[PDB]
Design a protein around this ligand. Structure first.
Ligand SMILES: O=S(=O)(Nc1cccc(-n2ncc(-c3nn[nH]n3)c2C2CC2)c1)c1ccccc1
Length: 289
């Protein structure tokens, strides 16, 4: 009990510093301490009950600055603290956690599209590079299942991608997996039960509402019910056996919609609205502050 869905940063007109937390048990939102630097295109994750904001870009009137930053929010104090920075700025990043370590995957720095990957050790406050992906990927969806790290879709600088790959830590090696049925860049990717879900994204022409899942045993991708709203640059997380998608861009509006997927019924429902529409947030779940 006592866990909230935290949304950090995002974009509406400019990059945002908001940190807000939604309580599924009572529908409430809390506004918490702002990020030190506004950022969109970041990712969130949690290790040891602390929330981390990783990478992104500050789109502002004074300029556009890609972020190498790692910042840590402690719900007990409602304070952000800087951590060691990554080796390189990474906007439109994906992150995943394996055994207490944060993997930062891909992303962009100006016109550079990264294949590089680095791993953070909270106990030592150090980053180190690991093997790079087989493909350069920005807007990459990342998730961890059974202590394996998946990188899904994205944009390589020329093509939006349906391809996906998996990192096997004990071999420090990436291998391609079955490609998705749909090209998706800037999708939401998460794990639920024994599958990697990819929701929404942009296929080069349209924002998507379709959702597909990769069963890691059978190596197949299967479509599930589509979301009510097409969305790119959505936030995504899992909480108590359901997927939550937050915001994004539908080609017309920066959405405030939050939808929730129930895998038992294979249905999506609208569960709340963010306090304002935005895209490009980072999202994770930890204890209330
Ligand atoms: O400020 S945003 O939130 N930035 C952002 C954040 C997270 C991921 C991505 N992302 N990553 C690769 C691509 C991409 N692939 N092919 N074309 N585009 C994108 C874009 C399409 C969503 C972008 C922002 C979003 C939508 C409209 C205006 C601003």
């Amino acid at each position: 009990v006592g866990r909230l869905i935290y949304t950090a940063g995002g974009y509406f007109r400019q990059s945002l510093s908001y940190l807000e937390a939604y309580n599924p048990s009572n529908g409430s939102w809390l506004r918490l301490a702002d990020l030190q630097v506004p950022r969109s295109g970041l990712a969130g994750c949690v290790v040891g009950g602390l929330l981390y904001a990783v990478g992104g870009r500050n789109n502002s009137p004074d300029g556009n600055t890609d972020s190498s930053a790692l910042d840590c929010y402690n719900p007990m104090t409602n304070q952000w603290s800087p951590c060691a920075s990554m080796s390189v700025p990474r906007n439109r990043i994906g992150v995943g956690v394996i055994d207490g370590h944060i993997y930062a995957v891909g992303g962009s720095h100006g016109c550079i599209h990264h294949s590089s990957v680095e791993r953070y050790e909270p106990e030592r406050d150090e980053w180190h590079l690991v093997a790079p992906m087989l493909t350069r990927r920005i807007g990459v969806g990342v998730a961890v299942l059974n202590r394996l790290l998946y990188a899904v879709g994205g944009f390589d600088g020329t093509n939006r991608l349906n391809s996906a790959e998996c990192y096997y830590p004990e071999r420090n090696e990436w291998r391609m997996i079955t490609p998705m049925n749909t090209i998706r860049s800037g999708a939401g990717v998460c794990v639920l039960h024994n599958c990697i879900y990819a929701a929404g994204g942009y296929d080069g022409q349209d924002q998507l509402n379709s959702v597909e899942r990769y069963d890691v045993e059978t190596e197949t991708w299967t479509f599930v019910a589509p979301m009510r709203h097409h969305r790119s640059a959505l936030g995504i997380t899992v909480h108590q056996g359901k997927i939550y998608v937050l915001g994004g861009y539908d080609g017309h509006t920066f959405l405030d919609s939050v939808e929730c997927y129930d895998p038992d019924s294979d249905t999506w429902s609208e569960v709340t609205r963010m306090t304002s529409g935005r895209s490009g947030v980072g999202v994770a779940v930890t204890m209330e502050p």
